[PDB]
Specification:
The structure is a homodimer of 185-residue chains. Chain A has two domains: 42 residues, Arc Repressor Mutant, subunit A (Orthogonal Bundle), CATH 1.10.10; 139 residues, Tetracycline Repressor, domain 2. Chain A is mostly helical and 185 residues long. Chain A has nine helices and no strands. Chains A and B meet through helix 7, helix 8 and helix 9 of A and helix 7, helix 8 and helix 9 of B. Chains A, B: One of its GO terms (molecular function) is DNA-binding transcription factor activity. Chains A, B: InterPro entries: Homeodomain-like_sf, HTH-type_TetR-like_transc_reg, HTH_TetR, Tet_transcr_reg_TetR-rel_C_sf. Chains A, B: Pfam families: TetR_N (PF00440).
């Protein structure tokens, strides 16, 4: 589990300071091990960053599954980021940071796509559960709706980054609710 | 109109080769003028690039208004990029190129936002015309729907750029049609 303890040290630095601080020197110091042992367990510094990122993203999904919901409508708001739980703010800060690194880090590029597919599958699962429970309609198939919901929230957050003048960031929940309602009721 | 002829030369280089080729030396040669006259008429090389970009974007809207449509449903597909007119491919190539430059060019940053607002207002106008003509419903206000439609298509195209494995780019029209139908019928 000494490899796991190195990973846990990288995850702490990632959550608190981001990817650039995640040098092998720093991680070895934090895990109280040698840089030689970090290199033994991980093929590259970028492999370690991506593996810690994926662990933190799996951890984000775990945390999200402990918020109490009564409906799949509620769980969709959480999965789509419309509820801004304060616990998850450093997790989302890392996610946005990873999004910028996929254009210069091959391992982070692959890990980001794996996390995207995991996110899509968690939305599919919530949609299909809501349909099975009688809460959601099924005018379109669940895979199509999930990609459209992800596309919407990523696009809306992309437009917020522009700093446009007639667009209030505080409307994100209201817009996301409207789209969820139109797609599923 | 000698200033206008310099602008037209910059627009030709922009459409054919992109922003990096738009040096003052190159534009002066193409407009058959002196670099001194280019500097007289334009405050900076980046001012010239942004002014030519905005002219080409206004030109894209003009071209789009000449495609014959029978419904506002059809015009929305065109405005949202779902119909891939071959004429507009170099215009859209420049638009995506500008999107990358807003993080290092202050004038392109401002011009891109102006074009975004112009795009939003053209969608608002189409929505409100379709509602006035009896073709569209009005469950939400036209400004809200327009931002959501722009957010969707930008988000969908952003997800296409990732190179995910279970996502077919050829589905863009089908997804955009579904969202238009849900928002407006």
């Amino acid at each position: 589990q000494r490899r796991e303890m190195i990973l846990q040290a990288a995850m702490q630095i990632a959550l608190a300071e981001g990817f650039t601080a995640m040098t092998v020197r720093r991680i070895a110091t934090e895990a109280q091990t040698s840089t030689g042992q970090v290199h033994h367990h991980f093929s590259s510094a970028s492999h370690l960053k991506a593996e810690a990122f994926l662990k933190l993203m799996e951890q984000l999904d775990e945390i999200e599954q402990t918020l109490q919901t009564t409906s799949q409508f509620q769980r969709l708001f959480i999965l789509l980021g419309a509820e801004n739980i304060d616990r998850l703010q450093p997790y989302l800060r890392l996610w946005n940071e990873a999004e910028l690194l996929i254009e210069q880090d091959i391992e982070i590029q692959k890990a980001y796509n794996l996390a995207m597919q995991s996110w899509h599958q968690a939305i599919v699962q919530s949609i299909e559960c809501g349909q099975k429970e009688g809460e959601f309609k099924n005018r379109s198939n669940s895979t199509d709706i999930a990609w459209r919901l992800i596309a919407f929230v990523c696009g809306l957050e992309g437009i917020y980054k522009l700093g446009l003048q007639g667009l209030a960031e505080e409307d994100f929940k209201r817009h996301t609710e409207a789209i969820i309602r139109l797609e599923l009721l």
